[PDB]
Symmetry: C2
Subunit: 221 residues, 2 copies
Amino acid sequence: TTNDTYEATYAIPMHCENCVNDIKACLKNVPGINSLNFDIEQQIMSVESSVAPSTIINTLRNCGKDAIIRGAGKPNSSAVAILETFQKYTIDQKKDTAVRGLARIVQVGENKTLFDITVNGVPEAGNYHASIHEKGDVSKGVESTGKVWHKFDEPIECFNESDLGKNLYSGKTFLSAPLPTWQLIGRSFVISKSLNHPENEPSSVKDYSFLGVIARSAGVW
Amino acid sequence: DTYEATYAIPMHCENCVNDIKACLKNVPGINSLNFDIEQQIMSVESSVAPSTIINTLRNCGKDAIIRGAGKPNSSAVAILETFQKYTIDQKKDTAVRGLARIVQVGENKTLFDITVNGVPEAGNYHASIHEKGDVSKGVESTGKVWHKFDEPIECFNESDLGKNLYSGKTFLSAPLPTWQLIGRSFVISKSLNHPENEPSSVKDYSFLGVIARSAGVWE
């Protein structure tokens, strides 16, 4: 049925001669694809299929191609959330900025959203967890954002060395949810992990979290 | 054009409710006034300009604050911050310079409680809503002006927060339901008086924030 098929746009470097040809060979045997359309100039590929974006992205990765979700210019379809800490932590000594992550969001189809999540510069290595809280009021940090509205089960593994600090960690993950962008905007995107040593935190806080309001975006990244 | 709006007003004193009623007694266009003494909130149903109710209460020495009425996706807030260094702005303890409290009170009517505090240059500031709430690059990434508010925010009052800084406040109304506003950016700006002294070659002093869903409860 029509609700089973949808449109998704990906940014993929394709200036080289065999560039487009290799991408076509890469996806030729993937079941469920109705069409692949390329825009060499903009270096983007539009895919109409019943194939989960993680699959398209996963397959492209298997072909050595880095595909990044991108907005297709349709109204209220793309969003972004700049994730920052909202309090001091004994373990977090990075003072230049409070930003620790970024969530890029694009809606594909009527009730499907893909989340390109990046974490960079956290002081404690480990598995981080993402969720969307009901409100986007960050006047009091996570406290003012209300209850968990959507929980993502897939952890964000952060064990890589950060390019922001030799002693910091980074991680990346790609998630999806059966939600449209209009239900996400204005809410808060939160990533957190239980502190390894809460005793040393005078804040009496138990979790290390960074979050941001989900904002409308052009999706041109 | 009748609509209902809720306001938080201190009303626990002996003559508190009676003084408010006396205050609004002669305002033409009020259909009903509902006082919830426990919660200290007053719901007003009228065909009167929202500013008329706010200004009238002000003339009676009463501070009315807009309050969300609990209907889905009706209240929002935007914490306004600068996103770049300004020669004239030496306040480093925080980038926060303002706040917009938003409450939808009608099918096509929304009220905005706008506060500015701590700006280095006195003057008239202007509010607008930009298309995107993306602040990955300050106002630049927020795209084009989506809605422009004609009423300025007069900032000439002495700031309670700082030395030689200014503050101001404005109450506005616009035919823009909250669902159209969330996720976009609320921007307040004023032309810099002396752009030459600004090495960033910027021309406007601006502070902004993403419009976020809120419970609608403020002080």
